[PDB]
């Protein structure tokens, strides 16, 4: 889309995540899974019901009673209530369809900016330790585990560690 | 002929205020009222054209 995650340089979605919208897929000697990212997923949740608690709550109440109470006496007056009538139904018509397209622009753009950057959140954690493979993988140049996977995924790696290993193995 | 009549009955409306006197004076073809309607509004509505079925 707008930031290249979605449609992008990762082309597809994985049908076996259900846990949430934005998450990992490991790949090591233990075995391989998908899990999800719960921070993520929620903010983006919490953003989109105030999103559709934004356009729907904002609406005015106002009772109102259509109808024609004009007779053929008064043409003139008929006439009056339609253009009226008429007249807020093009409002209300062309700003809500134009409405509903401008937002789901955004929200698309917007899940695109979280998956992106989820993405650059990892990569800058890692550094040059893995091969950075463009299809949004990243393959180590060290060999990690289920106890080093869960340590990126939580924010807290240990880049110094693998550090000279990963150099070895790089210039290989 | 409306309804075979050639002859009309014109009738008019208004609202009595409370403790307000009405006046009736005729010579003649007066239509007079025997009953009256108390009223009272919150606010106005509209009227509902459908064929059927309150429920
Ligand atoms: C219509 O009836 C009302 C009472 O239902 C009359 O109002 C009262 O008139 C008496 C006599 O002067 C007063 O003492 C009261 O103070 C009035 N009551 C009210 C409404 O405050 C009224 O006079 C009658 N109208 C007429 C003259 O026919």
Not at chain 2, 40 to 55: D, N, Q
């Amino acid at each position: 889309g707008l930031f290249g995650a979605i449609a992008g340089f990762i082309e597809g979605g994985w049908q076996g995540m259900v846990d949430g919208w934005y998450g990992y897929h490991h790949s090591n000697d233990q075995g391989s899974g998908y899990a999800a990212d719960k921070e993520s997923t929620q903010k983006a949740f919490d953003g989109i019901t105030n999103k559709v608690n934004s356009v729907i709550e904002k609406m005015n109440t106002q009772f109102e009673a259509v109808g024609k109470e004009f007779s053929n006496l008064e043409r003139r007056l008929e006439n009056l209530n339609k253009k009226m009538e008429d007249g807020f139904l093009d409002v209300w018509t062309y700003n809500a369809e134009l409405l509903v397209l401008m937002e789901n622009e955004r929200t698309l753009d917007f899940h695109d900016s979280n998956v992106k950057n989820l993405y650059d959140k990892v990569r800058m954690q890692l550094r040059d330790n893995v091969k950075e493979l463009g299809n949004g993988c990243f393959e180590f140049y060290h060999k990690c585990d289920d106890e080093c996977m869960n340590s990126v995924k939580n924010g807290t790696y240990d880049y110094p560690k693998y550090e000279e290993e990963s150099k070895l193995n790089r210039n290989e | 002929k409306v309804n075979g009549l050639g002859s009309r009955m014109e009738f008019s409306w208004t609202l009595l205020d409370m403790w307000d006197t009405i006046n009736f004076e005729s010579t003649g073809n007066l239509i007079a009222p025997e009953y009256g309607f108390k009223i009272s509004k919150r606010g106005s509505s509209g009227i509902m054209k459908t064929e059927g079925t309150l429920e």
